[PDB]
Symmetry: C4
């Protein structure tokens, strides 16, 4: 089976809870990796949580966070959805301090970037075998999604950035077939900033919603077909999606400069001119999480919206979030099902531990009754070490 | 292969021990979840233990049992029958503080209820994919079996309650096909109370024996066909099945008010006008367990019975119990095999630990020689934390 | 595939080492069961180590050996050959304080005896489903092999004993087909004593070599065809096989009374009128282990032998031992391959720990070069708890 | 599918990182074996890490490294590539203090040598079943590759040494078919010394690059066809491959006596008259690692080379290294892909711990962009025990 990727997004009314791993609570006693970016991706058969670890466990001296983010120890691993990430249940994928993965219907593509800041190399694997490499073209921290790539009709697609995180950088779309790059194009995007894209397939094309770390408190997007013919923009809604951000107000279809520097990995789903935005509840802190349906929010700049569904209370820590889909080949549906995961970050810099880790929760979009609540991490910090 | 569910219960004389997990004894040293309701359910290929955890391990601070029962941390997980429930051998099923699961011959149906007391939502999954949701209709702790649902001819069936635990509530039978609710009916059951139903298939229909928490010390039952044409009653035997309960005496085919408030999840199997009742040995405490064959106990009110088989001594803790079956498709028999599990609850409120957990034992009904004994939990409490 | 069991034992010259699990050394730090009787049995596909645990781990208070041997906590579990027996790698088989298991080519038969001393019940499972039970007929500790049953032509065979361990008891051969007892016969064996038989298939029949705990320092044997037509005797060699035993001398084809009380589970392989005897090196202590080829030792009473191969030095602890075979269906050979395992018992009563456990080693018979050595347990006792 | 082994080495420009297990960092907290020689080998389906353990865990008293290398506790085990080697994820292979393994397309061949120094026996297994033994022919530490054997056209091939480690010894090539030795030949190699060969298939033949422990600071090699018609030599490059070694200078096509005694397991790949040499960065210590492309280094004695790629910085420990390949049957390529692993040795003698263990990294040769870096072990020593 190659996933066709030709279906359109399912009609939905809200979000039903799909998983919660309690990784940090369990890690208080069990042997659980210190992790970041616990992104989900699915095949035609099953779903997995991918993550990066510093190859260190919770409640151990090696969890000391002072280790640079981009270390030679960092690896991309995966485990079944909803399980604490342990060396006893986790598959090794790639050596990586920035990553993506996705399944095309026939096998897993994983992308893992390691190496020095001035010459990082992305190693691409398909079915665990090295199939290609991509080296840094601007010599300044080649980096990728930290969530699932998108697959349509036997090709898979991702976005990579190279250059400053605080100014203009360079952004490329890659088309990958059985783990080999067969096409790429650089975005002609002056004044845009793309990091940490959340990309999903929809109607034979791909939509990516990303993080502007330079000068945007709304989210940039890029969409493209199988030929890499692309469009770019920012989400117009005055319901601002980044963190930090200003209070909701008048949006812009370009980068909103107020509170624009810095950011958080996030996602959104476009439905016609409307948008489901996932975002933190706080405008200043990585706290809380909510889903907002803004029926004109893709193209219109008002701060009006119609539905809010709570996911994590503002009194609890959240973190990165990303899209994942479930294809008809997996679900038996006639439409592409949208889902998302949230990383619940504990420890530094907000809390007094030597380490920083996340646990995860995830939700799937359904057209049936749902409810808002708070499903926070739940660990009591500090631990012993 | 869909399970037909058209066979009648096997002729049996007694109960042969099937499993014992020693979960709590193992968890004194190993990495074992704090759990409750370790219910067994089987496919055409294998049997699993399902359970709810607060996503915390024995001998750890997060096991602190002051946490609400209905917490956002609670998850339904499963592991192979007879193994200690660990993060290293347990599959994630659903986020849930009340649950059921069963296999239809083709895939697993899991039902996990989470969300707030005033608006809980049951998430249904078939083969791990969300297929439906059911929202609270009385805004008062939507809740379900805590043991296996029953499947017949490609549909599976369960009971949900919404409303007070100490007065009249609302009870519904759900018919589910490949994870989708295709029919439901509310029981017209004034003066009845149904919680925590133990439901099994028998001759193309389903029988549920439940817990009246309001005002009955005998057990309510409901039976129904594939169309949800139902019958209701209480078990007539003066061999009372609930805990607490009075001493054995004259029964009633309606709710026996003496010691009727409160209760424990349990089960019974109807054979003609007779009944096998599983029950605690104590009338006041969750202590001991025994199987009683009362050959007229379904419909007659005397306190006479013909066989008692000891399962757990009165000097040892017991707990929840439930039915599960093994279908002909699994066993190769021409009849439906009755089995049951018993949860052996340790810790709070009876014992001085910060936590409450159960281990489990299980038995299958056989027409060959058996013996009574005591197979208790066996852990030495307290631990270290 | 049903295993035919029609081949004869392979020609061999010695024993090549097959596995060593280091269970107790690993258990010093890891989560490893306290176990006894780590017997191996194989299918047409793979080999497993079966064992009994008290459902307690090494370095834990629950390992306290003062627990009766015949406890309600004891379970039969299995793990892959050569792996430390852990709750994280071990399959649950049966609740049992005495056990057997074997594969017929189509599925696993397990036999697990639990219950009280005066009315123990053997639960038989095939493919993990209960298929039969056998209750104590003398009301005095029904008990079985503690090693693999033997399968020939789709039937499997075992020996059970009921009665005194220090005087005349009752001994039965059972023929089991797909987990159902289809035939049994009681041995007419006055003055014989059979416990803990080690039984293997050979040329369409079964040979069992056992332990006389009453008054024999040589080993009793029983052989039988598929109809349960049997013969009985004792191994004639003056190379005495039990522990304790006298120094080698003149044997007897009946029970050798000198040092005859007490014993140890062991095995031997008959080749024509010759015998491969496995035995401890000490005559008084469960110390050392060696294989001895006595070319006339089955039928003749001299103490002469031709080959000794060391297995464990006399300065190291050994323990129970048993036969297992590998059938042509597994190996591709034209003959039945003999193998054996040895349990290396550590702790009480010989050593100052609260617990008693064994690790294991195993060897297969080959017609190619081999060498004698010592492969002892290797743990340094006591542990922390 | 038998692996043909008829393809020639893939054209490559550099080495892409394939795995990193972080074994020692993880073992600071988790249950991880003390290991040595973590060699990788692959089938037509997957790659595994094989390793020797003393059957003891990190942070435990049994890790005490005063134990002989050649102990009866040492076992060959395997786990998936990139996972910490634990008792919970590792398969048992053989009892062994020296080993090799490889897959022929149909099953795994494992070779494990145990027994005393004066009479060691190699036990060969195919699909886990004993298929042959080879006994010491010089009664002086029979020993083998400590990395994968090489398979071509249904036969697999290895090298064994018997005799002094500090003088002339005896060297044999073995040809093995389905686990059975079908041919062997002794090398007529006066004044050569072969230990710890790294052997790979290439164009229907096999090339082994080895360690001269007697009197060579360059590496000896032997190549042979399927008939065991062989050639011998030393790598001519003045870029010396052993450790210890002199500074680069004039090489020799025979053994380079300067700093020739002692050595380290290593590998090299021949391309035409050129060579990729993997080596430590230090000439005196097992520190650093680098890959050097010397385009005439197989046959010419100059110290010129054209490419250096850094793998581990000189300020970090390295250790043993070996070749492994990925066959077309696995990769879908039309050429034989070269890979290598490096063992990163921590503990004794260089560091103050009771133990010595290695973690691992591995790389595959690619014709696409790569980068040099340092991917060292990363553990902070000592631990607690
Ligand atoms: C998590 O990682 C952190 C970074 O690695 C650790 O913090 C560091 O701790 C070290 C202690 O090893 C400390 O080192 C220096 O501290 C002083 C500088 O302000 C200085 O006085 C010290 O110099 C003395 O000691 C060293 C021996 O290491 C000798 O070489 C010197 O001659 C002298 O005697 C020393 O250089 C760092 O300051 C500190 N890093 C920073 C910048 O925060 C944490 O310890 C670790 N956390 C845990 C819990 O392990
Ligand atoms: C492994 O299991 C063994 C058996 O269970 C334990 O040994 C037992 O330890 C207990 C202590 O609980 C001991 O109990 C009695 O000891 C005295 C009899 O000689 C007697 O003075 C004691 O009576 C006092 O204490 C009890 C409280 O438990 C009160 O009820 C009394 O009123 C009085 O104050 C007590 O009854 C046993 O003697 C002993 N068993 C034997 C026969 O060896 C081990 O402790 C255990 N090992 C470990 C390390 O845990
Ligand atoms: C358990 O939790 C409750 C409420 O949070 C608290 O009062 C109590 O101190 C806790 N117990 C322990 C031992 O931490
Ligand atoms: C390690 O073993 C040696 C020899 O048995 C001994 O001399 C030493 O004390 C041991 N080290 C430790 C820390 O136990
Ligand atoms: Ca921003
Ligand atoms: Ca709007
Ligand atoms: Ca532990
Ligand atoms: Ca009640
Ligand atoms: Ca009655
Ligand atoms: Ca005896
Ligand atoms: Ca003799
Ligand atoms: Ca050398
Ligand atoms: Ca050169």
């Amino acid at each position: 089976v190659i996933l066709t990727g030709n279906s359109s997004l399912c009609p939905i009314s809200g979000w039903a809870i799909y998983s919660k791993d309690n990784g940090i609570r369990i890690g208080s006693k069990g042997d659980v990796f210190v992790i970041r970016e616990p992104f989900i991706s699915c095949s035609h058969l099953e779903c997995r949580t991918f993550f990066l670890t510093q190859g260190a466990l919770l409640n151990d001296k090696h969890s000391n966070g002072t280790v640079k983010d981009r270390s030679p120890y960092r690896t991309l691993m995966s485990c079944p959805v909803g399980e604490a990430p342990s060396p006893y249940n986790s598959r090794f994928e790639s050596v990586a301090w920035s990553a993506s993965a996705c399944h095309d219907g026939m096998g897993w593509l994983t992308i893992g970037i390691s190496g020095p800041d001035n010459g990082a190399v992305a190693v691409l694997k398909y079915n665990g075998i090295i199939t290609d490499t991509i080296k840094s073209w601007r010599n300044n921290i080649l980096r990728t999604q930290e969530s699932e790539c998108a697959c349509v009709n036997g090709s898979c697609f991702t976005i990579m950035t190279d250059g400053p995180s605080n100014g203009q950088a360079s952004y490329k779309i890659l088309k990958i077939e059985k783990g080999k790059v067969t096409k790429s194009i650089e975005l002609n995007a002056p004044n845009y900033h793309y990091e940490e894209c959340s990309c999903y397939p929809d109607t034979g094309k791909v939509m990516c919603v990303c993080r502007d770390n330079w000068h945007g408190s709304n989210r940039p997007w890029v969409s493209f077909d199988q030929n890499l013919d692309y469009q770019i923009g920012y989400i117009c809604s005055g319901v601002f999606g980044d963190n930090p951000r200003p209070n909701d107000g008048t949006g812009s279809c370009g980068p909103v400069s107020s509170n624009g520097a810095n950011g958080i990995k996030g996602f959104s789903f476009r439905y016609d001119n409307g948008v489901w935005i996932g975002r933190t509840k706080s405008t200043s802190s990585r706290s809380g999480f909510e889903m907002i349906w803004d029926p004109n929010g893709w193209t219109e700049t008002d701060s009006s919206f119609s539905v809010r569904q709570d996911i994590v209370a503002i009194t609890d820590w959240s973190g990165y979030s990303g899209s994942f889909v479930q294809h008809p080949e997996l679900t038996g549906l006639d439409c592409m099902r949208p889902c998302f995961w949230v990383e619940l970050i504990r420890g530094q810099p907000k809390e007094n531990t030597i380490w920083t880790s996340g646990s995860s929760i995830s939700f799937c979009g359904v057209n049936s009754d749902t409810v808002g609540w708070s499903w926070p991490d739940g660990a009591e910090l500090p631990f012993s070490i």
